[PDB]
Structure formats: structure tokens, C-alpha cells
Design an enzyme around this catalytic site. Structure first.
Site: not given
Ligand code: HEM
Ligand SMILES: N=C(Nc1cccc(COC[C@@H](CN)OCc2cccc(/N=C(/N)c3cccs3)c2)c1)c1cccs1
Ligand SMILES: [Cl-]
Ligand code: HEM
Ligand SMILES: N=C(Nc1cccc(COC[C@@H](CN)OCc2cccc(/N=C(/N)c3cccs3)c2)c1)c1cccs1
Ligand SMILES: C[C@H](O)[C@H](O)[C@H]1CNc2nc(N)[nH]c(=O)c2N1
Ligand SMILES: C[C@H](O)[C@H](O)[C@H]1CNc2nc(N)[nH]c(=O)c2N1
Ligand SMILES: [Cl-]
Lengths: 362, 362
Positions: B65, B68, B237, B242
Site C-alpha cells: 500500500c 500508508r 480512495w 488503478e
Molecule cells: C487513503 C487512500 C488509499 C490509497 C490511495 C491507497 C492506495 C493503494 C493502492 C494503489 C494499492 C494497490 C492496489 C492494486 O494495485 O490493486 C493499495 C493496496 C493496499 N492497500 Fe491501500 N490505499 C489507501 C488506503 C488504504 C486503507 C484505508 C487500507 C486498510 C485499512 C489499505 C490497505 C491496503 C492493502 C491491504 C493493500 C494490498 C491489497 C492486496 O494485497 O491485494 N489501504 N493501496
Molecule cells: N492472488 C491470489 N488471489 C487473488 C486472485 C485475484 C485477485 C486477488 C486480489 O486482487 C488485489 C487487487 C487487484 N489488483 O484488489 C484491488 C485493490 C486492493 C487494495 C486496494 C485497492 N485500491 C484502493 N485504493 C483501496 C481499496 C480499499 C482501501 S484502499 C484495490 C487475489 C492467490 C492465488 C494463490 C495464492 S494467493
Molecule cells: Cl479496483
């Protein structure tokens, strides 16, 4: 331990190399000879076949290289016969000429005598055979900042740069037994440069940007079967992003994006306008256009990734493990538009390969 | 082993959490209580302070993320009191409303009862609370392909989509003890969507693109001190890339780059024209422009990386180890224009954190 590492590496390389060359039956007798040679001399000498295929395998094993589809057409020039600095200079001049090939770039490597007791026979100081100088003093930055330390070292050796933004560094290398390197100015007739113009935007030439045609990496060590070829300059052709997204764009390089923005007629005031992204795209279009217009080889990142995908398919069909460095294989613009971005790669080190070595200056 | 993992994780979390909260002296007595609670009940219950700070720590520890910097202003809604599906639905409706905040998005998480014997109390099927359906049959692709399997599962439960390219999926979740999930249609008054227009190119609206305002991830497990909150939807947001570089651009998503190229008046014929790169930049400018025009929060990748740099500096000054996933932190357009691209990050997993869990369907 020295000779043991050597013998173990030699064994693995010969077996693999001769397998690939369909010389599998000759492995036993060759390894015996090598064992004697190491026993008696502390090292062994590669056949021309071994050396050539070794350098190709080393390219094929370079995890960071997107251009590996063409590993088997590498042009290997064997210069293990060189003994004098005039011979080294003329070999480097020749590499430039034959690799350049009037613009139709030939991927080439020239291989000099290898290290002995870890003792270098020829020590090349240049990062690339053709590269621009850099200067920094009292707020004043000129040329390529990445070349600042080498430029400073050259100016310790009696050389003096004109201090334009595009001074060609001289060749600089040291011979075994000599305390100081020698330097030689590049004949300009050997060096193709490309002026950067844009296909649609006439004002782009006001930037007076240019780059050199052929990147020839001259500071990496080629390792083949335990033999350390520390001096073995190689070249391919550029992928356009290397010039447009990095050399001309990086803030710690030529830093041209604000000037690009101005000449293409957009504001460079708001992050949300994505002016840097748009400038990067137009500068990169200009680089590709200019190299094409000039008759100098170059590849765009889309075609390059498409070629790399074929390399992956080739490896699978040949039954070879594929290794790669995802962080380097992705291009620095639109990486998610390439397949590379969406898969993963095993970054394991396989030999033969090319390796970093410590700089002889700084 | 079960309870042992729990007690060890509990110990580490409380000590760290109470340190950060300046409650260091209270650790001993709290851990004693917890030890009893685990001994007698097989688990323990977090204080509201622990739960709130835990969720914030979990965000701070999310290696992928870029957002953060703002971890400490997360809005935590404690819904561990829910017992009925009406209560779960209304809590999800409320999360959407309060997170949306008329466009001025509030980063929020709603936390439902945690797993017991690894037994879920509430099982959410949605990937995000607001997301578009996808359909694929007989050559015909409609909507978001990433939603195809969930859409198919919903249509097994009595729901039917209109089969536009932007059908809002219903909320779908299962209660402990129920064999099938229930579904509820989203009140459209709760859902802000943004039509995609371009600041300069009037024809861009001919694409009739739109996206939803608030990404609310509802399928990840929040783990805090050994407690598994499998149902804890959260939102921030969007970063514009994205939507513009991935959701609308990927060939396996909405795949709009050729149509973008056409409306912006460029050819999509030659790789060397970098038409995909240019299309990506204009589509991404359009997304940012549209969200801004509509009064809906969004951040561009340059500002986001600038904020992330501050997060790195904050961690260093607080004496905390920084962890990150370089491959996810780099934005998918102009990544080398951000500082992220030029450094490395330790990808170690630190808890509390958010984790993937197996889908309840497919
Ligand atoms: C405040 C605005 C925020 C922005 C702009 C932001 C931005 C992002 C972006 C761009 C990603 C990559 C997502 C992707 O490529 O699919 C991401 C991943 C992530 N964000 Fe944030 N984020 C924000 C807030 C948060 C919040 C509030 C949380 C949780 C409380 C969070 C937890 C995560 C997690 C867990 C991922 C990884 C998702 C995964 O592994 O699939 N983020 N964030
Ligand atoms: N990858 C696996 N599972 C899996 C399969 C398909 C999709 C996914 C999860 O996708 C992650 C992403 C897609 N790029 O989800 C969207 C996402 C995640 C986190 C933040 C995102 N954007 C944001 N800005 C936010 C949303 C909420 C707070 S911030 C958007 C997981 C695995 C396969 C085997 C072991 S793990
Ligand atoms: Cl999305
Ligand atoms: C044929 C054209 C070629 C193209 C288009 C190509 C493309 C590239 C690119 C873009 C890089 C990344 C460079 C950077 O970001 O700084 C790279 C790295 C590399 N290439 Fe190639 N390459 C080609 C040929 C070759 C050849 C002929 C060799 C050696 C025989 C080679 C060996 C390598 C090595 C070792 C690296 C890694 C350099 C490092 O780690 O610093 N490549 N290649
Ligand atoms: N990184 C270190 N050393 C180091 C410091 C600065 C620079 C470098 C090497 O830079 C690698 C890159 C710069 N991005 O060199 C340019 C390059 C390398 C390889 C291919 C390139 N482009 C091409 N197309 C080709 C050239 C020759 C054949 S193909 C261009 C190395 C270390 C520090 C501590 C341990 S290692
Ligand atoms: C294989 C690779 O890890 C995968 O394509 C990743 C790359 N980096 C990413 N980064 C972000 N932010 N989002 C993603 O979906 C991905 N995909
Ligand atoms: C820290 C990071 O590894 C570094 O910035 C890398 C990223 N990927 C790269 N990829 C290429 N091709 N060339 C580079 O110089 C770099 N720099
Ligand atoms: Cl270069």
C-alpha cells in the site's frame, strides 16, 4: 580451494556446453585434459567453440535482459591474443566499427585475455566504450552526471573535456604491469550519434538533444567455466525507453522533462495534469522516430517484450529453466501494458553469466 | 498448538500496541487477564482501543500500500455486536454512506465478529462492496471479467443482472449456520459513480465510460494479536492509475485502449508510435479530471508517491522498521518518475496485517 572452485565450475560448464553442442561424447576426454592443465598450470584455456558458446550462454542467463531472444546470434570476437595497449585500442576501435555496422547494429562481444591469479591482464575503466562526460562544480552541471567520477579520473591523466553536454569520453584502460591507465580519443568517424527530433512537433529540435547509437558495456566480467574474463565489452542495440525514460529523463541524468513539457506546449505545474507522463511519452516517441529516421537500430518496449515472450516460449520448448529479474525486465513506461508485468520470474543466478566488478577508480 | 499461537501473538501485539499508546505499565495486568480468558474460553476479546489501534497498525504494515501515510486517521467502526443478516446488511450500507461522505472520502473499516474455531460468524462473498458484474458466454463479453465467477454465483441465488457493462453486484454474504448466502441490491442513492470525460477532448464522452467512487475491499482477513477478523471491509480512495491503467485498460478487464486511441485521434497500428502509452496517459488524465470535477476524492500517482516518501521519513523518525513490496508500490505508469522505483524495500510480513483468504465460492 582456488583450483577446486575452478575444476568444479569447469566440469559443470563443459558438460552443459558440449550437451548443447551435441558433443556429449567428447566431455570425458576434454575434462581429463582440463584436469591436467589445471593441475600443472593452475588454470585452463577454452577452445574457440567453448568461448563462443560460453558468451552466448552467459547472455542467455542474464536475468535482467529483455533482449535475450537473440542470444544465439551473438558475434564473438576472440582477442585473447592481445599483449600491447595499441592492440587493445585497435580491438576496441574495431569492435565499435563492426558492431555499429553503418547503423544496422550487430550484437557483438570482444573477449580479451582473462584474469590469472585474479590478476587482470587488461583493465578497462570505461562503463561503456561510447559515453558522454559529466562535470559538476560550483552549482554548474554539464553533461552526464553518471560520468562525473570517470570524467574526473580522466582529467587526472592529462585529458581535458570541452565541457559541452555531449563530450565523448576517451577510451581508458590499464595494462598489467602499468601503474596508470592510458587514454585514447575516439575517432569521430567511428561514432554514430542521433539528433532527437519529433515526428509532429517541429519545436522539439530546439532542445538540441542527441544520443549515441551503440551502447557497448565494457565494465562487466564474463565468467565461463571458472574462467574470469574481466575485460569483455559487449553490445546490443538500445530499447528506446533506456534513452527516453532514463538517460534523458532521470533527474540525476539529463533531467529534460520540464524542457520537453515546454516545447510540446503543455504546463508543468500540476501533478494531476500528468505532465511528466505525457512528456515522457512524447520524448520516447521522439527517440524511436529519430533512430528509425537515421537508419540506426533500436527497439520499442512493446516489441521487445513481445520478443521476450518468444524467448520464454523457446526456453520452455527446449526444456531449459527460465530465470529473470522482474524489477529490471519491466519497462519504465507502461509496464502493465506488457505481459512481463503480469507474471513472475525466478531470479536465480546461473553461470556462465555477466557480473559486476569493482571499479578501478574512485 | 491453537491456543499457543494465540497466546504468543496476543503477547506480541499487546506489548507493542500499549507501547505505542503510552500504556506500557498496563501490559502485565492485561496479559494476565488475557491468559485466563484464553485458558477458560479458548480465545480473548479486544478492548475498543486495542481493536482500533490494531486495524491502524495492520494498515501501516500493508507492504503493498502506497497510501500508508494516513494510517493513523483510519475510521474504525466496531460492529462485533452484530448477530443478524439485517444488521450485517445495514452495517454495510452504513459503511458505504459514511465512507463516501458525499464525495469527500473517509478511510473507514467496519469490523464484524471474528472467527471462533476458525469458524466464521459472517462470511462476505463480495471482493469489493461496490463492484460491476461480468458475463461471458458464446463469444460475448459484458462488464468486468474479474467479476465473472462471483456474478455467476449470484445468478445461482435468484439474482439476475441487466447485462449492461456496469451492473452493480448486490451485497452477498453468509451467516454462520446458514447454508446459503443472502443477497441484497445496493440502494443506488448510496452509490456515487463518476462519468469519465476528458478536460480537452470532447469526443472522450462518446466512450461512455464510468467508474464507482469508493473502492471498499471486503474479502481480506484482518489479523490482530491472534484474532482472525475475516469480515472487516475497508476503504480508502483510489489512486487514479488503478482505474485508468488497470481496470479500464487491462486486456482482461475493460480493455479500452484501442477505443481511447480512436477518440483521441491517433492511429493504433504501430508499436513504435507508442499509441498504447499515449492512450494510457490521456485515459489517466481523464480519470483524474473526472473525479475532481465530480467532487470525489482521488490521488494521482505522483502525489501518492510523494506522500509515501513522507511515510518512509515518518517511520525512520519514529524508529520503526519500514516494510514494503516494491513490485506493488511502483505505479503502473511512469514508475521511474517516482522515488519508489529507485530504492528497495524489505518485504517482510509484520502483524497486525490484512491477508488473503480462500473464496467461499468457485
Ligand atoms: C487513503 C487512500 C488509499 C490509497 C490511495 C491507497 C492506495 C493503494 C493502492 C494503489 C494499492 C494497490 C492496489 C492494486 O494495485 O490493486 C493499495 C493496496 C493496499 N492497500 Fe491501500 N490505499 C489507501 C488506503 C488504504 C486503507 C484505508 C487500507 C486498510 C485499512 C489499505 C490497505 C491496503 C492493502 C491491504 C493493500 C494490498 C491489497 C492486496 O494485497 O491485494 N489501504 N493501496
Ligand atoms: N492472488 C491470489 N488471489 C487473488 C486472485 C485475484 C485477485 C486477488 C486480489 O486482487 C488485489 C487487487 C487487484 N489488483 O484488489 C484491488 C485493490 C486492493 C487494495 C486496494 C485497492 N485500491 C484502493 N485504493 C483501496 C481499496 C480499499 C482501501 S484502499 C484495490 C487475489 C492467490 C492465488 C494463490 C495464492 S494467493
Ligand atoms: Cl479496483
Ligand atoms: C540485442 C539487443 C539488446 C537489447 C534490446 C537489450 C535490452 C536490455 C535492456 C533494456 C537492459 C536493461 C538495461 C538498463 O536498464 O540499464 C538489458 C540488460 C542487460 N543486457 Fe541486454 N539487450 C540486448 C543485448 C544484449 C547483449 C548482446 C548482451 C551481452 C552479450 C546483453 C546482456 C545484458 C546484461 C548483462 C544486462 C544487465 C546489466 C546490469 O545488470 O547492469 N544484452 N538488456
Ligand atoms: N549497483 C552497483 N554498482 C553499480 C553502480 C552504478 C551503475 C551500475 C550499472 O548500471 C547498470 C545499467 C544502468 N541502468 O547500465 C547500462 C546498461 C546495462 C546493460 C544493458 C544496457 N542497454 C543495452 N541495450 C545494452 C548494452 C550492451 C548490450 S545491450 C545498458 C552498477 C552496486 C553497489 C554495490 C554492490 S553492486
Ligand atoms: C506478477 C506481478 O507481481 C503482478 O502483475 C503485479 C505487479 N504489480 C502490481 N501492482 C499493483 N499495485 N497491482 C497489481 O495488481 C500488480 N500486479
Ligand atoms: C531500486 C531498483 O531496483 C532500481 O531503481 C532499478 C529498478 N529497475 C530497473 N530496471 C532497469 N531496466 N534499469 C534500471 O536501472 C533499474 N533500476
Ligand atoms: Cl545507457
Amino acid at each position: 580451494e582456488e583450483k577446486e572452485i575452478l575444476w568444479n565450475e569447469a566440469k559443470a560448464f563443459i558438460a552443459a556446453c558440449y550437451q548443447e553442442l551435441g558433443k556429449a561424447a567428447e566431455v570425458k576426454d576434454r575434462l581429463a585434459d582440463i584436469k591436467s592443465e589445471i593441475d600443472l598450470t593452475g588454470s585452463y584455456v577454452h577452445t574457440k567453440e567453448e568461448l563462443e558458446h560460453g558468451a552466448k550462454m552467459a547472455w542467455r542467463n542474464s536475468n535482467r535482459c529483455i533482449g535475450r531472444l537473440f542470444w544465439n546470434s551473438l558475434n564473438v570476437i576472440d582477442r585473447r591474443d592481445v599483449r600491447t595497449k595499441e592492440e587493445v585500442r585497435d580491438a576496441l576501435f574495431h569492435h565499435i566499427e563492426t558492431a555499429t555496422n553503418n547503423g544496422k547494429i550487430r550484437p557483438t562481444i570482444t573477449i580479451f585475455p582473462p584474469e590469472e591469479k585474479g590478476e587482470k591482464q587488461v583493465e578497462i575503466w570505461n562503463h561503456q566504450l561510447i559515453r558522454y562526460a559529466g562535470y559538476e562544480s560550483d552549482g554548474e552541471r554539464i553533461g552526464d552526471p553518471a560520468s562525473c567520477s570517470l570524467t574526473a579520473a580522466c582529467e587526472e591523466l592529462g585529458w581535458r573535456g570541452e565541457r559541452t553536454d555531449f563530450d565523448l569520453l576517451p577510451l581508458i584502460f590499464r595494462m598489467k604491469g602499468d601503474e596508470q591507465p592510458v587514454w585514447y580519443e575516439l575517432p569521430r568517424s567511428l561514432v554514430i550519434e542521433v539528433p532527437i527530433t519529433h515526428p509532429d512537433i517541429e519545436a522539439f529540435s530546439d532542445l538540441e538533444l542527441k544520443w549515441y547509437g551503440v551502447p557497448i558495456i565494457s565494465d562487466m566480467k564474463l565468467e565461463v567455466g571458472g574462467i574470469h574474463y574481466n575485460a569483455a565489452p559487449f553490445n546490443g542495440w538500445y530499447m528506446g525507453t533506456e534513452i527516453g525514460a532514463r538517460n534523458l529523463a532521470d533527474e540525476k541524468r539529463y533531467d529534460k522533462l520540464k524542457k520537453v513539457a515546454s516545447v510540446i506546449g503543455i504546463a508543468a505545474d500540476y501533478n494531476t495534469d500528468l505532465w511528466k507522463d505525457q512528456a515522457l511519452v512524447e520524448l520516447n516517441k521522439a527517440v524511436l522516430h529519430s533512430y528509425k529516421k537515421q537508419g540506426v537500430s533500436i527497439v520499442d518496449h512493446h516489441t521487445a517484450a513481445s520478443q521476450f515472450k518468444r524467448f520464454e516460449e523457446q526456453a520452455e520448448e527446449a526444456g531449459r529453466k527460465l530465470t529473470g529479474d522482474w524489477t529490471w525486465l519491466i519497462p519504465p513506461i507502461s509496464p502493465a501494458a506488457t505481459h512481463i508485468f503480469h507474471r513472475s520470474y525466478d531470479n536465480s543466478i546461473v553461470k556462465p553469466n555477466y557480473f559486476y566488478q569493482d571499479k578501478p577508480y574512485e
